[PDB]
Structures are given as C-alpha cells and as structure tokens.
Amino acid sequence: TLFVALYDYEARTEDDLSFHKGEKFQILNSSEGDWWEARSLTTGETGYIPSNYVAPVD
Numbered sequence: 001t002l003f004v005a006l007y008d009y010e011a012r013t014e015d016d017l018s019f020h021k022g023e024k025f026q027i028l029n030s031s032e033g034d035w036w037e038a039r040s041l042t043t044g045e046t047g048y049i050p051s052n053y054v055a056p057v058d
C-alpha cells in the first residue's frame, strides 16, 4: 500500500523527511514505531515520516 501526505511537514533533523501535502510514499519500515522510514515517489528521498501525517492511497 502507498501512502499520501495529509499536510506539509518540515524535518527537524537529518533523520526525518520533509514533504508537501499530497506527496506519495512507499513505506520501508513501519513496525519500529509510529514514525516510518519512507521514500518519496516524487523525489526518491528517504527518511522518517510521522504516520499520523499520511493515509493509505484510495
């Protein structure tokens, strides 16, 4: 399942990933907690994203 961003997010460190509303991601690890390692389908950039900022694509 792909996920889509609900809101803009600005990373605080190197480890999380900034993204814009509507960006889509493939998820890499989601059982480490509620922050998921993801890859932007737009930029291929990877980083942790807050899972409460995304939803599964329709």
Ligand code: NA
Pocket (backbone or CB within 6 Å): 051, 052, 053, 054, 055, 056
């Ligand atoms: Na979510």
